[PDB]
Amino acid sequence: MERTFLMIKPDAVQRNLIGEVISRIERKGLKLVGGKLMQVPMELAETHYGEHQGKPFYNDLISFITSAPVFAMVVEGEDAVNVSRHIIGSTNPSEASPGSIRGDLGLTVGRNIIHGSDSLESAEREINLWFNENEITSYASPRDAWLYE
Ligand SMILES: Nc1ncnc2c1ncn2[C@@H]1O[C@H](COP(=O)(O)OP(=O)(O)O)[C@@H](O)[C@H]1O
Ligand code: VO4
């Protein structure tokens, strides 16, 4: 089943929104398959956001993601990558739909609560980067028969 990488960013953690954010993912029918609260080391920060190295916000991004722990997650479900991005909302919280996580909880583009992989390819990339196979569980859930045909 399709898997994506989600990350509750340090703003959400420092605003005590971990449970709230997790709830929104669960109730959507997505399966939490891997999850750890962790401090992000510089190397991991920089390789995760390597595609932004030149940008204006880059230094501020590394600073921010390392400033306090994150909750890194692997989420499993049909179309999980797009489904997650759908309930997460647009990058800028003021363009994100009300009812989405960024729409409801985020104020600014720089502090926008959660990360989700943007494609199938970056999903597998980010998952390998943040997680080892032995930290990703695999289980059947009671509701599985009721989310899918
Ligand atoms: N103008 C900006 N200033 C500060 N941080 C930004 C800005 N734009 C994007 N970011 C950071 O990057 C994260 C994801 O958006 P971005 O990296 O631009 O695209 P993608 O979601 O494809 O990686 C945002 O949640 C935010 O933390
Ligand atoms: O931190 V993100 O690249 O899923 O907006």
Mind explaining what this structure looks like?
- InterPro entries: NDK-like_dom, NDK-like_dom_sf, Nucleoside_diP_kinase, Nucleoside_diP_kinase_AS.
- Homotetramer.
- With 149 residues, this protein is α+β, with helices and mostly antiparallel strands.
- The protein is built from 8 helices and 4 strands.
- It starts with a strand and ends with a helix.
- It has a single domain, classed as Alpha-Beta Plaits.
- Strands 2-3-1-4 form a 4-stranded antiparallel beta sheet.
- It is globular and about 45 Å long.
- Bound molecules: adenosine-5'-diphosphate and vanadate ion.
Give keywords:
149 residues, Alpha-Beta Plaits, 4-stranded antiparallel beta sheet, binds adenosine-5'-diphosphate, transferase, globular, alpha+beta
What's the gist of this structure?
By secondary structure, the protein is an alpha+beta fold. The chain contains 8 helices and 4 strands. Strands 2-3-1-4 form a 4-stranded antiparallel sheet.
- Counting structural domains, the number is 1
User: What is CATH's topology name?
Assistant: Alpha-Beta Plaits
Shape: globular
Ligand species: adenosine-5'-diphosphate, vanadate ion
Pairing-aware structural class of the strands and helices? Answer: alpha+beta
* Helix/strand order: EHHEHHEHHEHH
The CATH architecture can be named as: 2-Layer Sandwich
Strand content: 15-25%
The spatial strand order of the largest sheet comes to: 2-3-1-4
**Can you count the helices?**
8
Taking the sheet with the most strands, its summary is: 4 strands, antiparallel
Rg over alpha carbons: 15 Å
The tally of beta strands, per DSSP, is: 4
Oligomeric assembly: monomer
Q: Which CATH class?
A: Alpha Beta
Distance between the termini: 14 Å
In CATH, what is the homologous superfamily?
Nucleoside diphosphate kinase-like domain
What's the helical proportion of residues?
40-55%
Active site: 115 (pros-phosphohistidine intermediate)
Organism: Staphylococcus aureus (strain COL)
Binding site for ATP: 9, 57, 85, 91, 102, 112
Family: Belongs to the NDK family.
